[PDB]
């Protein structure tokens, strides 16, 4: 969209470098530099003044040097209110009553897909599975995995931990890691005490689960976001993963 | 159908306890054989422990004992904790025979020696008395089953001795749960942990054998006669 | 040796001119029926970086070493598809500017730093 | 089964024919079906009448004019399911009659000119537009007249207010500010009002009489004598301050609307505008803001009885106060054949100016209507209507009801006429006079609560939008049988009272009487009385009407309930709830999706594809039944045979049920026996268990089914085919694909396998790297035509059982600017309970499953069979739903008892007549127990045991009857499946109805470690093959922040998603197992930099030492 | 409160490690517990107060005796209209603790209370509306009609006091409404400022320090007194001596 | 363990002359009970068919 702009801005600074070559005409050349800023000007903040570039037909203003930059998503916000994972999921969360604290949710279908790469060589490195890639086309074979596989998925896991996340997450404890399990149903599975922190609700609503790989990352994570070893709100010096409404 | 046999583990003490665990089992025989089985080691179990306690010197485990440091109702206890096991095949019922002397502190193998028995945790505070303090000790034992308040049958070897709670349960404390792993594209596998605690009587493991045992015979009676 | 400040400097014709790489003082680009920019424009990639995997627009030693690749009639130096990510241009105006953030902003930077009636001057 | 029926009042009248909003609405505006000459306005008649006695410009002189005379009524060119197959907007064309005289006269009328099309309306209440159903819903906006209200932005001082019908007048506002003036604010203007008062034929001391000496503010809207002057020159002052750029005397061509005749201001034809700008004003008025063409000037009527109000507000005295702006006698409602019609003054508007313009340019002799219009403006403006406004809704047609209720909503929101997103909190709230006629348990939760809602089931809006709500009248002691609807502001004068009292016979019995006045509760004298409401149904919504024992429930988590029953999907062995409330069965009628017969007579033919009757003598109708048709929400709806081959029928009856529907009964869900309680933390904070059980039974399962579609268009790389012909495509894999590129109906579907296959050429150009490592995955490198075939999208999928196929250029079928060549497949699927899954009671009790277990689990009763959903207690304390609890009584009641029950609105059974029948249920229960040769065992007296130590029993009592004493106390013991011993504590149980809502974990559920890189921002979007790509905001930084997670944020803005370097990169890192990341600098670093230089500012880069970076390398 | 004490208590004395451990079994073994003890809940466990008509009784009573007190002229429209009002909330204070104090004496193990008792659910309020009743409402301008609500929910409220209770909740659903929208408005702007603000050091060095202010002036009595529990922990709590003290 | 029918492509369809739709009739033999008498009897298919 800005591409269309930087447009005439060429289109101008040609048409009058001819004039200038030939035919004098004072009054025109006037009325002509009269665009090659306009030109720019658009370009740069369009929207200004009081004409906004009119696409010969929309009547849509078209960003700017300006727009672009200002925020809106514009290359300064956008950094602090989005982008898009790489290694993410989320889903309905369940109770984890068995579940240790610690512990952790997620099934396998997606625990599976959210871990496809460190299993893969994972593979490899044990007797199973030739070459690299040639893995790649095992749990690609639809649906129905074999047996050893999954044994390989665990030691594959038991370590890592994730980090998880309800809707408005709101204090650090927003987010937690666990040395999550795999389990049936294909709903994430909590364990209590913690609900507390993300208002954690049991209606239907849902969390995310983030993975970090970063031997970095991972070890930033439960020893400093391990519900376990976060249990008080700094809100307040008061715990959080208090017993409760039942309990 | 399909799924293999259990793996049996034990991660046993020497006397008390043991963390026994059987791995493998399709949905629901975690709870299903288990909570019978508590039921079982708590219940219907080969074992002996005191009847009765006669004790020169004042009736009443509620009255007051000179020369004595502690009272009647405390020996009662400490007599509890106190376990004995049978050397004859046969021999449901003994009489043991307890000696104080002045400033001592009373033991549970201090009781008379006697072959035919055994005393099986000689230490135990019982008792301890100051100067000059005596202590005949009556003490009738029984070969009981569970558990029977002393109030409940009514000892009667002597008119001034005292009954008391028997607590010949060698199965003092058993509690399971029924996590469950995986093997497999499975995950919710029963996985079965008992955990038994006893005196130095019977050891733990028995504790389980002689239990299935039992319910195992406690199930040839649904028979077809 | 890592980051550890970012100033802001101006913008300098003769600096502009320094990047661009190229220099765009060319018409339209794009092509839709062959892909490809336009004989010099906005895509001509010859003064970017190759749109391609390393290779030139006609074909030359995708070759990891050397440094410098370029041709007879396919100048198209060889160093990734990525660079078109950053490697600038330009168009070498016909005479005067304003980038306007110093005309029409909120103080008028240079109807004050030269007075020129505040504003309906310039 | 056999039906029992609680409480009296016997409602006097069934309910309103409910549909009635849209229908009856919309056939009372396109009257095509009563003689042209006749129709008494309103709709397409007063719209092509206010804009048709269309001259030309210039007033006498050059001839060309243009009437009206008759308006002639289409034929649908297509019927209803075709023009849903083929996307067709059902319209009609809609021709009339012009005939225009010259200035030397010709009578040459144009038999039928073409001004466009206008959508028929369906028995239903929506409409077909462009394809599926869309419902034209009703706003509600603030009714015409005059109230003032006081000052906003000025404590103290009151503003006036001169509101016309709204597209029919300009906005007025009389505010008194400090400068002592009385200014006029008019369509975005702000002079002094002293310029008005003389335009209209007032002095220098006649603006001091009628108003002055009380409230010296006259005193400031008078000095001013540059402007206290002549007729014609206030006139020019007037026309060069309201409307720049033209200074002549014709500031009676403009100032023309704003006053007489009704081109613009007028509030209605003398009703609410009038009627009531009268009893509060300065009483007479007839139809406009003044009038105009009298004698000669200006004869002001309403710009002075209410500019002596509104100061004399400002001191004043007695009778002269505030209105309420938020009164229904004060509000109004747009039903939906108007807002057609409205978009008809706007549709008959950019047409009054495409043959004003015609008439300049063309001869005007070679002129013939037909010849002077294009009629395009009707078209894209009456098209743009049922295509694009904020009001013209989807259509929730997850259930039947829902379909209905949508129709019912109220809103605020709308195009132009409306609320913003943004105010409303002196209109959100409830207000004294909704009773009866707006449901205040409806709205939505948040973001838009209040606004919108659902009507009040009797209430009916009539005339000028005034609700009506249904009273009985009496004669002051007697009671008769007359009822009487009426408005709101015919209402706050009368002393009404509750159905609720008692009443002998047919009048008043007892002295102490509860009764309201306006909206005042008070306790009234048997004969004081003026009416009394015909039932508490007249009082709540539609569907929060279901609700079984609303008399016990707290008001929030209630209208949770009447909701949420909306987000009700079907099932198939569905069961209407044990407990009632009569309405039950006839939601299913009127909404239609049942199939009922208009004459009695008798079926011969009967099957699943259809059913064929001989009604008496009537001939032999043969309606089929929709079978698996999808929805919109995708649901999938179908109804059902339900009679037999031999039979006389009933006048009309169930000739064969819907979606979720059992024999005329709404059956939202599937009434259960469910078990109170808390199990290991297994329901915990609002979590349900279920028995394996219903999947055994397949108790609760829905069907579902997703709707596909494709495109291909006509390109200059060449044109998108699509045939069952595409390269390096393993035969096994085409394997079902008879059609030639379809898939054939019946196949079993999976992800990723084929679907529609679609060869576009493309390319030019030659694949590199981040897709040649992917790629292979996309290629082995190539073809001179491309695979970008359908494909099912990650996890969906089914059995297909639909195809769908159009080209451009069939008969109706129109595609768009590009395209050509249409495809949709169909496939469903069936999908019992997963773990999570979503469901809830109408006492708004929702709550999804964590744990489904087996039926050896399970808490089960004495008696073997065991229950189903163990509903933890917990979550009923906080929230005030009793009721809920009161259901699953009676449901044990209703159980051993065999039947169902109806406990209407506050009209329900009751503690002491329910402990009847549940004891009623014991005495049959325990009967069979005993009979068998039982009798209570240790368990259960055990429970006994303690059951008195607690009170809830009453001591000294065989086991026996601390049994049934308990039993009927809604209890009783559980066993544990799990471990012999029973529950230590009665526990309540029973068969408590519940549904399965929209959401099912099915749909939701994701997950990716890797995928599609979207091209344009560089990131993780769309999914071909893989899916998903997880967003994250800033929230999640801060925090990520609060804790020093310093990579864990770095990683989280880096190899996980724009830096194009890492992801790769790190990507392969793994494939490897290495450190992994390490990213050399952020790519949106770089970016920004030369975002900025690419807009000057070099911004450098140093250290410590301050020195040239290298930011770039390249 | 209890447990919170200890779990923070033990947290104190006993490494995070444990810490957990505790918390966990009592999630587990309270669970289980708190289902062995198969607690439920039948309507007729939502007790009533004998004593409701009595109070409902010699209340509805102290009525004809301020109407019949105004027939005359006793009390002025604005003396009388504050009399009905301050009335049924004296009478609804005794509904409230009565049925409370029964709740003591006689089934001290009601399903209801002991919850709200214990930690579980339930508060001083809600437990009201169920058993003994509701109150007076509050009109839609802030107002509150004269008229009370005598039926409780565990009674199927009528008619009437349904359509005025009902303006509650959704005046208070506005709350929810307006009051969840507004992201973290807060949020954000605070952010923006100290998101610099970090530990960056051990000691500023300085000497300078703070005043603690322990007893409350109340700006109206001008009286003293110390300020309420939490309040000074939450604002000791964890702080820094500056001059030692004696006491 | 399943079943089949005339024309018959999925468990969502109709036939003609059957008031029931495969699921009716799915939902109606699901229930059915079969005695096998014999030991060896792996499994075996039954076997129905209507006229009129």
């Known amino acids: 969209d800005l591409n269309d702009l930087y447009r005439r801005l060429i289109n101008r600074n040609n048409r009058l470098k001819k004039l200038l070559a030939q035919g004098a005409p004072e009054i025109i050349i006037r009325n002509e530099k009269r665009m090659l800023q306009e030109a720019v000007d658009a370009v740069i903040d369009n929207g200004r003044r009081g004409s906004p570039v009119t696409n010969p037909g929309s009547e849509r203003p078209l960003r700017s040097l300006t727009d672009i930059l200002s925020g809106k998503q514009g290359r300064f916000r956008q950094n602090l209110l989005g982008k898009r994972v790489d290694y993410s999921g989320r889903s309905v969360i369940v109770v984890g009553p068995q579940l240790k604290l610690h512990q952790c949710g997620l099934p396998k279908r997606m625990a599976l897909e959210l871990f496809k790469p460190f299993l893969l060589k994972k593979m490899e490195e044990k007797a199973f599975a030739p070459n690299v890639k040639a893995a790649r086309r095992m749990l690609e074979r639809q ?91 700094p809100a307040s010096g008061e715990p959080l993963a208090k017993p409760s409404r039942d309990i | ?102 400033p001592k502190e009373v033991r549970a193998g201090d009781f008379t020696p006697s072959a035919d028995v055994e005393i099986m945790n000689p230490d135990l505070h019982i008792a301890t008395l100051e100067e000059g303090g005596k202590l005949y000790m009556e003490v009738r034992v029984d070969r009981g089953v569970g558990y029977v308040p002393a109030e409940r049958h009514g000892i009667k070897d002597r008119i001034n001795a005292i009954p008391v709670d028997a607590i010949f349960s060698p199965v003092r404390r058993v509690a399971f749960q029924v996590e469950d792993t995986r093997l497999g594209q499975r995950t919710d596998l029963d996985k079965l942990t008992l955990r038994i605690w006893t005196d130095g009587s019977v050891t733990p493991l028995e504790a389980l054998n002689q239990a299935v045992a039992i319910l195992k015979e406690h199930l040839n009676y649904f028979a077809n006669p | 040796k890592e980051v550890r400040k970012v100033r802001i400097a101006l913008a300098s014709p003769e600096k502009i001119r320094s990047w661009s790489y190229g220099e765009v003082e060319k018409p339209e680009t794009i092509n839709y029926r062959t892909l490809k920019p336009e004989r010099d424009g906005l895509f001509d990639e010859r003064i970017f970086g190759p749109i391609k995997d390393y290779e030139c627009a006609c074909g030359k030693y995708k070759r990891q070493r050397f440094e410098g690749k370029v041709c007879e009639r396919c100048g198209v130096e060889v160093t990734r598809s990525i660079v078109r990510r950053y490697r600038m241009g330009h168009i070498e105006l016909a005479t005067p500017a304003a980038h306007i953030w110093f005309v029409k902003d909120v103080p008028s930077k240079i109807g004050t730093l030269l007075d020129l009636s505040a504003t309906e001057l310039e | 089964m056999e039906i029992k029926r609680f409480g009296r009042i016997r409602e006097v009248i069934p309910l309103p024919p409910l549909t009635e909003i849209q229908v009856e609405s919309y056939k009372k505006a396109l009257q095509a079906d009563v003689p042209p000459e006749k129709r008494e306005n309103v709709g397409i008649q007063a719209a092509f009448k206010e804009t048709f006695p269309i001259e030309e410009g210039d007033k006498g002189k050059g001839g060309l004019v243009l009437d009206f005379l008759e308006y002639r009524i289409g034929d649908p060119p297509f019927s209803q399911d075709e023009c849903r197959e083929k996307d067709l907007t059902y319209q009609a064309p809609l021709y009339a009659r012009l005939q225009l005289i010259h200035k030397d006269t010709g009578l040459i009328k144009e038999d039928e000119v073409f001004l466009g099309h206008l959508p028929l309306m369906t028995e239903d209440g929506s409409f077909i537009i462009n394809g599926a159903d869309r419902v034209i819903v009703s706003q509600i906006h603030r009714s015409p007249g005059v109230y003032f209200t006081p000052d906003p932005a000025r404590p103290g001082r009151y503003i006036a207010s001169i509101i016309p019908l709204p597209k029919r007048g300009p906005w007025i506002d009389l505010e008194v500010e400090a400068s002592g003036v009385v200014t006029m604010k008019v369509n975005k203007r702000k002079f002094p009002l002293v310029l008005l008062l003389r335009v209209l034929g007032y002095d220098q001391e006649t603006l001091v009489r009628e108003l002055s000496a009380y409230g010296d503010l006259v005193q400031g809207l008078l000095d001013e004598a540059v402007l206290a002057m002549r007729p014609e020159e206030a006139m020019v002052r007037l026309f060069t301050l309201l409307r720049p750029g033209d200074p002549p005397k014709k500031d009676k061509a403009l100032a023309y609307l704003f006053g007489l005749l009704a081109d613009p201001k007028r509030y209605d034809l003398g009703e609410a ?129 829902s379909s209905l209720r949508h129709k019912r909503r109220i809103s605020a929101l709308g195009p132009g006429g409306l609320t913003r997103e943004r105010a409303g909190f002196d209109v959100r709230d409830v207000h004294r006079t909704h009773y009866g006629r707006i449901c205040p348990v409806e709205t939505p939760e948040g973001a838009n609560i209040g606004l919108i809602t659902s009507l009040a089931a009797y209430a009916r809006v009539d005339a000028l939008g005034f609700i009506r709500t249904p009273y009985r009248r009496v004669k002051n002691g007697v009671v008769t049988e007359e009822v009487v609807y009426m408005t709101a502001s015919e209402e706050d004068r009368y002393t009404i009272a509750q159905a609720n009292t008692p009443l002998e016979g047919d009048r008043i019995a007892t002295d102490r009487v509860v009764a309201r006045r306006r909206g005042e509760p008070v306790i009234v004298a048997p004969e004081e009385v003026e009416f009394m409401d015909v039932s508490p149904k007249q009082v709540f919504s539609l569907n929060t009407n279901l609700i079984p024992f609303l008399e016990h429930d707290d008001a929030n988590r209630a209208l949770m309930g009447s909701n949420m029953q909306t987000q009700a999907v079907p099932l198939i062995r569905a069961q209407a709830p044990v407990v009632m409330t009569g309405l039950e069965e006839r939601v299913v009628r009127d909404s239609l999706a049942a199939l009922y017969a208009e004459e009695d007579g008798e079926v011969v033919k009967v099957d699943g594809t259809r059913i064929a009757v001989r009604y008496e003598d009537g001939r032999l109708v043969e309606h089929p039944l929709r079978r698996y048709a999808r929805s919109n929400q995708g649901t999938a709806f179908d109804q059902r045979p339900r009679v037999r081959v031999g039979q006389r029928v009933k006048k009309g009856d169930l000739l064969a049920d819907g979606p979720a529907s059992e024999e005329g009964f709404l059956a939202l869900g599937q009434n259960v026996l469910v078990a109170i309680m808390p199990f290991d933390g297994y329901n915990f904070e609002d979590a349900i268990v279920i028995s394996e059980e219903l999947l055994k039974r397949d108790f609760y399962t829905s069907i579902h089914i997703e709707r596909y579609e494709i495109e291909a268009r006509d390109t200059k790389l060449g044109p998108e085919r699509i045939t069952r012909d595409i390269p390096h495509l393993s035969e096994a894999a085409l394997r079902d694909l008879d059609e030639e590129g379809i898939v054939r109906i019946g196949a079993e579907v999976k992800p990723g396998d084929i679907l529609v296959g679609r060869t576009s050429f493309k390319g030019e150009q030659e694949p590199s790297p981040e897709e040649r490592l992917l790629r292979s995955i996309f290629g082995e490198k190539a073809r001179d035509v491309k695979d970008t075939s359908l494909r099912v999208p990650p996890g969906e999928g089914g059995i297909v059982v639909g195809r769908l196929r159009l080209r451009r250029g069939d008969p109706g079928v129109e595609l768009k600017p590009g395209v050509r060549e249409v495809v949709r497949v169909f496939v469903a699927q069936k999908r019992k309970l997963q773990v999570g899954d979503k469901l809830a009671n109408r006492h708004g009790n929702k709550g999804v499953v964590a744990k489904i277990l087996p039926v050896e689990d399970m808490p089960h009763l004495p008696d073997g069979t065991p229950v189903d959903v163990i509903l933890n207690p917990l979550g009923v304390p906080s929230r005030m739903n009793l009721g809920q609890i009161l259901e699953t009584h009676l449901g044990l009641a209703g159980y051993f008892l065999g039947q169902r029950y109806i406990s209407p609105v506050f009209d329900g059974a009751t503690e002491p007549e329910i402990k009847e029948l549940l004891a009623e249920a014991f005495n049959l229960y325990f009967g069979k127990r005993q009979g068998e040769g039982f009798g209570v065992d240790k368990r259960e007296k055990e429970v006994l045991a303690r059951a008195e130590k607690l009170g809830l029993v009453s001591p000294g009592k065989s086991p026996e009857e601390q049994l049934k004493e308990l039993f009927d106390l809604g209890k009783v013991v559980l066993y544990d499946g799990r471990t012999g011993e029973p529950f230590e504590g009665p526990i309540v149980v029973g068969q408590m109805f519940i549904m399965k809502l929209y959401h099912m974990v099915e749909d939701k559920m994701h997950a990716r470690s890797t995928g599609p890189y979207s091209l344009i921002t560089q990131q993780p979007l769309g999914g071909k093959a893989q899916f998903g790509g997880q967003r994250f905001g800033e929230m999640e930084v801060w925090a990520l922040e609060a804790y020093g997670a310093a990579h864990t944020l770095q990683e989280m803005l880096t190899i996980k998603s724009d830096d194009i370097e890492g992801r790769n990169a790190a990507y392969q890192a793994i494939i490897k197992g290495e450190d992994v990341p390490e990213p050399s600098v952020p790519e949106s670093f770089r970016v920004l930099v030369k975002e900025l230089q690419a807009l000057a500012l070099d911004v450098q880069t140093l250290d410590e030492k301050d020195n040239p970076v290298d930011i770039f390398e390249g | 409160n209890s447990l919170k004490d200890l779990v923070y208590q033990a947290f104190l004395r006993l490494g995070m490690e444990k810490t957990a451990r505790l918390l966990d079994a009592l999630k587990y073994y309270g669970f289980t517990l708190s289902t062995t003890s198969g607690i439920t809940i039948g309507i007729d466990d939502a007790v009533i107060p004998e004593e409701k008509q009595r109070y409902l009784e010699e209340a509805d009573r102290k009525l004809r005796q301020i109407e019949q007190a105004y027939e005359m002229g006793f009390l002025t429209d604005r003396e009388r209209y504050d009399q009905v009002i301050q009335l049924w909330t004296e009478t609804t204070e005794k509904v409230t603790q009565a049925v409370f104090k029964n709740f003591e004496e006689n089934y001290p193990f009601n399903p209801l209370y002991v919850m709200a008792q214990s930690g579980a659910r339930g508060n001083p309020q809600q437990i009201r509306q169920l058993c003994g009743m509701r109150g007076l409402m509050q009109k839609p301008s802030g107002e509150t009609f004269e008229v009370p609500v005598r039926s409780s929910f565990r009674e199927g409220l009528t008619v009437l006091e349904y359509f005025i209770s009902s303006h509650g909740a959704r005046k208070g659903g506005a709350d929810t409404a307006l009051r969840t929208a507004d992201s973290g408005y807060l949020t954000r702007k605070l952010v923006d400022v100290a998101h610099e603000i970090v530990v960056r050091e051990a000691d500023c060095g300085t000497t300078n320090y703070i005043s603690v202010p322990l007893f409350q002036m109340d700006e109206v009595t001008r009286t003293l007194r110390l300020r309420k529990r939490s309040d000074i922990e939450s604002g000791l709590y964890g702080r820094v001596l500056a001059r030692e003290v004696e006491a």
């Open chain 2, 1 to 102: 159908s399909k799924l293999k046999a259990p793996v049996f583990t034990a991660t046993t003490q020497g006397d008390h306890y043991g963390e026994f665990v059987l791995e493998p089992l399709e949905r629901g025989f975690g709870v299903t054989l288990g909570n019978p089985l508590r039921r079982i080691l708590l219940s219907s179990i080969p074992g002996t422990a005191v009847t009765s306690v006669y004790i020169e010197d004042v009736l009443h485990e509620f009255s007051t004992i000179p020369g004595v440091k502690e009272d009647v109702v405390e020996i009662i206890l400490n007599l509890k904790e106190l376990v004995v096991r049978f050397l004859d095949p046969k021999m449901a019922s003994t009489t043991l025979i307890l000696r104080a002397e002045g």
């Open chain 1, 143 to 233: 649906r129905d995995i074999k047996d050893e596989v999954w044994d390989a998925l665990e030691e594959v896991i038991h370590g890592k931990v994730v980090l998880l996340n309800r809707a408005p997450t709101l204090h650090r404890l927003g987010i937690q890691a666990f040395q999550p399990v795999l389990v049936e149903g294909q709903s994430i599975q909590l364990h209590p005490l913690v609900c507390e922190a993300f208002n954690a609700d049991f209606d239907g609503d849902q969390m995310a689960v983030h993975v970090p790989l970063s031997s970095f990352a991972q070890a930033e994570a439960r020893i400093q976001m391990l519900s376990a070893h976060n249990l008080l709100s």
């Open chain 4, 273 to 401: 505008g009038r009627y009531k700008a009268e009893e509060k004003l300065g009483v007479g008025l007839s139809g406009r803001t003044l009038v105009r063409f009298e004698d000669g000037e200006f004869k002001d009527e309403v710009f002075l009885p209410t500019l002596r109000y509104l100061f004399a507000l400002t001191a004043g005295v007695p009778g002269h106060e505030v209105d309420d702006i938020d009164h229904l006698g004060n509000r109004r409602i747009r039903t939906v054949g108007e807002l057609m019609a409205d978009q008809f003054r706007v549709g008959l508007a950019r047409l009054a100016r495409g043959v004003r313009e015609r008439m300049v340019m063309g001869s005007p002799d070679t002129l013939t209507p037909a010849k002077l219009v294009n009629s395009r403006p009707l078209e894209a403006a009456l098209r743009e209507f049922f295509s694009r406004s904020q009001l013209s809704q989807f259509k929730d047609e997850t259930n039947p009801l």
